[PDB]
From a paper:
The precursor PdDfsB is cleaved by subtilisin to yield biologically active Slf, and the chemical gradients of both proteins between two growing colonies could be accurately modelled. However, remarkably, the [name] gene is widely distributed across Gram-positive and to some extent Gram-negative bacterial kingdoms (PFAM entry DUF1706). PdDfsB adopts a four-helical bundle core structure that belongs to the DinB structural superfamily. The most strongly conserved region of PdDfsB is the C-terminal helix, which is present within the mature Slf sequence.
We were able to express, purify and obtain crystal structures for [name] homologues from Clostridium difficile 630 and Escherichia coli UTI89, as well as of IRC4 from S. cerevisiae. For the purposes of clarity, we refer to the first two proteins as CdDfsB and EcDfsB, respectively; however, we have no evidence that they are truly acting as [name] homologues by undergoing cleavage and release of their analogous Slf “toxin”. The overall structures of CdDfsB, EcDfsB and IRC4 are identical with that of PdDfsB, with strong conservation of overall topology and surface charge, particularly in the C-terminal helix. We solved the crystal structure of a S. agalactiae [name] dimer (SaDfsB) by molecular replacement using a pruned CdDfsB structure as the search model.
Residue numbers in the entry: 13 to 183
The structure:
């Protein structure tokens, strides 16, 4: 999706995040690690995936501003190693409760609003304004807002569909 301005991007993040996070309210902690064949991840893994990617995007931006060399997706994993990165997200966050994961994700979304407001329009909406954005997709050219959309709005919709499917079968 193309966004015309900062307020449009922030609004869509807020709208899709609120719908996504609300789906976890009715899931008891005792079932946060329950896997079924019909849906890929557990509820805790579903949240951990979002905490994982939002933490990384925020870190790329912070490190680049801090004058560090950003290796994307991370220092330990390459772009053809995402499956292993996802296992690392699960190992690193999924042992948390749903309440703790929701709180952490909410903090990252608030930080993403600050990240957006701290960028100039040019830095947010034009190519080649961040080294980490050029580094994260070397086959194509992606603007910062596109990385934000693809790591918030898009998965907040698709992973919402997963958790709803999971809830209909399990609860």
């Amino acid at each position: 999706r193309v966004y015309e301005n900062k307020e449009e991007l922030k609004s869509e993040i807020n709208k899709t995040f609120e719908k996504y996070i609300a789906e976890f309210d009715n899931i008891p902690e005792s079932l946060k690690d329950k896997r079924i064949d019909e849906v890929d991840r557990t509820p805790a893994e579903n949240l951990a995936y979002q905490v994982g990617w939002t933490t990384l995007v925020l870190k790329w931006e912070e490190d680049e501003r801090n004058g560090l060399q950003v290796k994307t997706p991370s220092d330990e994993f390459k772009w053809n190693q995402l499956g292993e990165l996802y296992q690392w997200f699960t190992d690193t966050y999924a042992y948390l409760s749903l309440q703790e994961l929701k709180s952490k994700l909410n903090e990252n979304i608030n930080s993403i609003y600050v990240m957006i407001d701290s960028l100039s329009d040019e830095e947010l909406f034009k190519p080649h304004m961040r080294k980490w954005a050029d580094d994260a997709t070397k086959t194509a050219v992606w603007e910062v807002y596109k990385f934000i959309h693809v790591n918030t709005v898009a998965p907040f919709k698709t992973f919402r569909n997963k958790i709803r499917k999971w809830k209909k079968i399990v609860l």
